[PDB]
Point group: C3
């Protein structure tokens, strides 16, 4: 007639790691690293992204003739751009502050293209000969669709003086440019006047552009360049243009109608006719898990990115095939027969045997391990969220600074995650070692010298303990005096 | 007849948090988070700040006629500037490298405005007509007080050639400007010479300014603009000016007399006629706590900023209404009667009863807990300290980079603060748990079978233990031989 | 007639720190901080550094005469620049995007200087009169040697139109310059043409340069300025020059042969004809230690920089001059006569008295301790590595951002390293305490009433073979129980 203290054991093969030991099999565990993605680009909460295909942001905004799919773009969630889009700036040149404009586009979800300066507004200039083979459309030379390349009419280029007032309540993105000719003859053939200028002015802008007539290398079949510029015209402000040649005048402008969360994603992955709440350049994430290792740059409701390969929290006890010396100590193994709890008793009397779990000790441990898991997840709610930022060829130091800043915070938070899991896993296992010892000691305090301590977690009753007597030991109501006289005689 | 082992209990309602349990009431606790401020701006160690009111740094340095309170500024501890100062640049334009100049002002505590080029030095130019209604002073057109707007004299603007040599043995801040006229008629009306230039040359500076005569929008009633520029003239270096129009000559220069710790604070709160050692834009801090959650940007000897709402370190033990089985284990509760220490004894004999504390074990716990608290404070002595950095409209990428860097370190150090407190509170509670068990076991080894283990932390003496016998147990000097026979006789 | 439970003690003076206690003397400990360097500049994995001596990068690239001739410079592991090079630009001026060029050079391991434009290509201009006293060689006026200062010939400076095509298939670094004259007379005496320009054009460059003739302060005895510019000519691309005066024309250019990890180190300590895998400006480091405190800026496979002055991990026991009550508890002191392991027994019996160690208990402690130390060595490899980034006087906001960022990451990883050692040192000392206690209880349950629990860690039994058997885990309680009742009273 004996009663024993024991703990749970199942067929689990899951393994966690600690600072002192690796690959420790446990009865229950919780993974906290999501590792899978659908490998496709999807809608973000029902909103389809804007995929520019092989068109760049500059080609879409300036109106590259090969980017005509994007003339009435619907509202977008994020913008997908291939790393090297081919339909960018058909006529060679540049877009000034292109990276700063992309930063502004990252906070915009929708444009509304509006005609600001019609071609009927240039009666004494030619509007149809600003066309080049570098910008082909359907076999014929064309040009950017949103701006107009003005050239001389009747061998004369009168000084232009035009102003547009943003009578709209929304901010206006306006683009214009200057044409760099190649020689003194081409300058005359296109704009009679030899020495030319462009003056652009607003409340804030005070810009004067002068063409650089020099010999340059051939790009896209053209030795000339076209430098473009942009500005944000505030409501009830006006832009004032003055030029006597080489003026690439605005025709359409973009009304910033929707501002919100967006990003310019560099990706060649395909749209998969799907929806998601979390999107990465490599694919979309579908998980309730607190961490992921897919990609640092994410958008939407996303888990926090880490560089880990495995991250599993220990929630149960060390499974059987010790700071407190109970689990894998004087109790050498767990019981597969005890299924209703983590800790409990095995009784053996003449009426039979059976397993019984101590619900109070088990529920206290369940509440503790649940609070620890919940505490660790909430402690990582505020992590570093990497953002995409673009820099040019002469901004390498700043680009390198942005790389080390985002990578440095990643290694810091990756280390914080793996070390907190490593440390708290050791604590969780030793927390189970306590509750078993405290359960063994609680039974030991109740039985006293009425039973014998075998040393394996079992108590050999000196008296006779039936099923009701067995339950009273588990109850906490074992009556020592009721059986003291029989135990006294049983000794020798 | 009986001696017991127990622990302290009091009326404290202070609560600490652990990883496995929150809102744990403890006997003693130390708050380490300051959450209060006086809500006013004060002097820093007896030095009053420079409060520019509605004037900007540009308006103060250039000499906006509406900023005449600051023509002689005393040495300041920090600079206070409202978010959107009204006065600023009375005549529309810009101050080149404005944010870079504000970065140099943050390392400067005092200027000495000195007159470097008098209006006497301009014999063949008009020095008293360069005024505008955009810069009114007591109902009459005026201009920036530190520069002179030179215009033509006798319908002639001879080419200016002037040089100033820094003989003041300290660095000198010099400001000058260029005026952008609106048309060829206004250009001639003010300067006669139609094509103008400004050449500024030092040992490192080689600048050429040319007016941009164009059509702009009206700002402060003026369609013209005025672009200002600055340099730091090192001692024994000379600045060379040359211009034939549109030149805004320096009159007064700022002499850097004292350099030290300062900051350009952005706040709308008012001066409170107070002194402090720590100042934030929302208020001043008078505290000895190691942490605060007032504002990230502080100046002076300050606590370390965290984003925590509560940060309480557990110093005592779980208060009564663990890993080791003592506190809230076989010892059910604490003793409100023990007030001399954390752990001790309760004796009950024929002479009477009494509460006594174990000085040795209590002092050992006090020293460890005190060293712990001091260790947690010391490891946070080197934290990230945010600094104010300004950026213009075309530095959004870097400004966003700066915000993410400073916010990322705040989240990292906040995480370290709450997690270290969360983990060490758990350890502190088990530390008290073990010390009670180690004290109960120490008496257990002394008495052996001379007393009966009650199981609740009390020992029922088989023999008679008087007041000095009870003291021998607390001393650790209990003579088991002297009473072996009586205890054996009392056992039947 | 007794066997006892005890732990190791020795003569160790090594100290560790915990959060609750400082200067704790331990039996065994492992230092994990490197604090020594050779104080020399050495080769990195067999490759000698490029030491520019008293010369700047710009002086070497442009061809300062007082600088070394720097011909056929071999492949370098890293570049060494004095903090304030005394040569730099002999003729006063500037080099556009100098810091961005040095960033590019930090990612380049070999240059090959090639002659791109011969002086034979200037028939109508003077190619030998562009010298100044500000650029002296042999006490005679000279100039930068990778660039030519073209001067008028026969009171004439005809407009120049020249092009060079990059046929090499490696990227090319080309430098040109402009002279800012002092007075209109000087302009004519040197170039005749009064209004001058320089036009430079490539596939990506569209530059126009007009001289600024003005009065300046004199530097190196010259009031004129020589402003230099650079570009990277991609393969099968051409650079096109056009100027009617004030043109400092390219003569030699630098071909990018190898692009790899390198750095511009700001050091003045001497080359020591040594080899290392880790170099700092103060000296080189040879160490397997996971941390170092020599200098933040390092090149090669290096330990991780921390601002700590001491970092010692506790691998052994609290030495005799806890959460569990064994060490410094009911066992008051350790055994110096016990040299075989951390835990074990001392026996007193018929055959003699003997100290023996429990190898199974010690090995479990050794295995866990080494696993902890190795787990602390790792999880530290992915730290922050500081890079040298340069900024000019009007980029001070960004320089402060860079400095605060690099110092912030150092302070974070310093806090992480010290707090990890403090916390795990304490857990180690308690791990030993539990190990001893569990050993004491393993024999306690075994012997039962066949021995008396003395309370000092010793058991008073009521032979060598039996003594070893209890240490094995075997004991026949029936075989030895009877004498005990008689031995009692
Ligand atoms: C663009 O048009 C608006 C609206 O006409 C001008 O803003 C003011 O609007 C009021 C309407 O009552 C007019 O009476 C004012 O004459 C206009 N402007 C003021 C005081 O600024 C606006 O100025 C025009 N914008 C520009 C740059 O010319
Ligand atoms: C473990 O047992 C469950 C049934 O209780 C079974 O569904 C599962 O397949 C088993 N898992 C393994 C790894 O054997
Ligand atoms: C732990 O398990 C993984 C496979 O699950 C194995 O690759 C690794 O070698 C194991 N490490 C140890 C220390 O057992
Ligand atoms: C055990 O506990 C239940 C209530 O939880 C009680 O009804 C029952 O009488 C107890 N039985 C014994 C043998 O103590
Ligand atoms: C708790 O006891 C202390 C001791 O006097 C006293 O200062 C305090 O007011 C008491 N608090 C309450 C709620 O009784
Ligand atoms: C802890 O105490 C605070 C203050 O009374 C209370 O707001 C909060 O609900 C409590 N939290 C828990 C888990 O009981
Ligand atoms: C300024 O004055 C000192 C002495 O009068 C002189 O040595 C120095 O050259 C002057 N500085 C310049 C740039 O001329
Ligand atoms: C620890 O020991 C060293 C060497 O004896 C000594 O320099 C140092 O002051 C000690 N630290 C403390 C806190 O006593
Ligand atoms: C350089 O030479 C190659 C070979 O003829 C030619 O293809 C290339 O176009 C040339 N580069 C330029 C810019 O002309």
């Amino acid at each position: 007639d004996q009663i024993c203290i024991g703990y749970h054991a199942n067929n689990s093969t899951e393994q966690v790691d600690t600072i002192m030991e690796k690959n420790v099999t446990v009865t229950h565990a919780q993974d906290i690293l999501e590792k899978t993605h659908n490998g496709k680009l999807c809608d973000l909460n029902g909103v389809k992204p804007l995929i520019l295909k092989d068109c760049s942001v500059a080609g879409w905004l300036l109106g590259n003739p090969m980017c005509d799919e994007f003339i009435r773009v619907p509202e977008w969630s994020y913008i997908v751009e291939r790393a090297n889009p081919v339909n960018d700036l058909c006529y060679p040149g540049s877009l000034n502050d292109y990276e700063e404009l992309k930063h502004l586009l990252s906070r915009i979800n929708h444009f509304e293209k509006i005609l600001i300066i019609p071609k009927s507004s240039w009666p004494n200039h030619e509007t149809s000969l600003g066309v080049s083979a570098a910008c082909p459309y359907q076999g014929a030379p064309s040009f950017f669709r949103n701006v107009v390349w003005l050239i001389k009419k009747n061998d004369a280029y009168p000084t232009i003086k035009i102003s547009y007032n943003n009578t709209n309540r929304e901010d206006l993105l306006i683009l214009w440019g200057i044409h760099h000719s190649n020689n003194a003859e081409e300058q005359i053939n296109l704009y009679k006047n030899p020495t030319t200028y462009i003056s652009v002015g607003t409340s804030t802008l005070n810009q004067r552009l002068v063409p650089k007539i020099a010999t340059r290398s051939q790009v896209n079949g053209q030795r000339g360049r076209m430098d473009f510029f942009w500005t944000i015209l505030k409501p009830d402000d006006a832009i004032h243009f003055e030029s006597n040649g080489n003026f690439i005048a605005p025709e359409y402008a973009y009304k910033i109608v929707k501002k919100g969360d967006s990003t310019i994603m560099k990706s060649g992955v395909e749209y998969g006719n799907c929806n998601t709440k979390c999107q990465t350049p490599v694919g979309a994430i579908n998980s309730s898990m607190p961490f992921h290792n897919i990609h640092p740059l994410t958008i939407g409701e996303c888990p926090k990115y880490v560089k880990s390969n495995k991250l599993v929290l220990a929630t149960g006890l060390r499974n059987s095939p010790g700071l407190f010396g109970a689990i894998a100590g004087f109790i050498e193994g767990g019981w597969q027969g005890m299924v209703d709890g983590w800790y409990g008793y095995h009784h053996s009397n003449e009426q039979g045997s059976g397993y019984a779990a101590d619900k109070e000790s088990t529920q206290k441990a369940i509440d503790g391990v649940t609070n620890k898991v919940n505490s660790i997840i909430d402690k990582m709610n505020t992590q570093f969220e990497a953002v995409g930022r673009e820099f040019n060829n002469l901004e390498r130091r700043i680009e390198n600074l942005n790389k080390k800043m985002e990578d440095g915070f990643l290694d810091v938070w990756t280390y914080n995650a793996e070390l907190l899991v490593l440390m708290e896993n050791e604590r969780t296992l030793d927390f189970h070692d306590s509750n078993v010892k405290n359960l063994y000691d609680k039974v030991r305090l109740q039985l006293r010298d009425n039973a014998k301590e075998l040393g394996n977690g079992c108590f050999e009753f000196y008296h006779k303990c039936d099923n009701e007597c067995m339950e009273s030991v588990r109850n906490g109501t074992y009556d020592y005096p009721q059986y003291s006289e029989e135990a006294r005689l049983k000794r020798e």
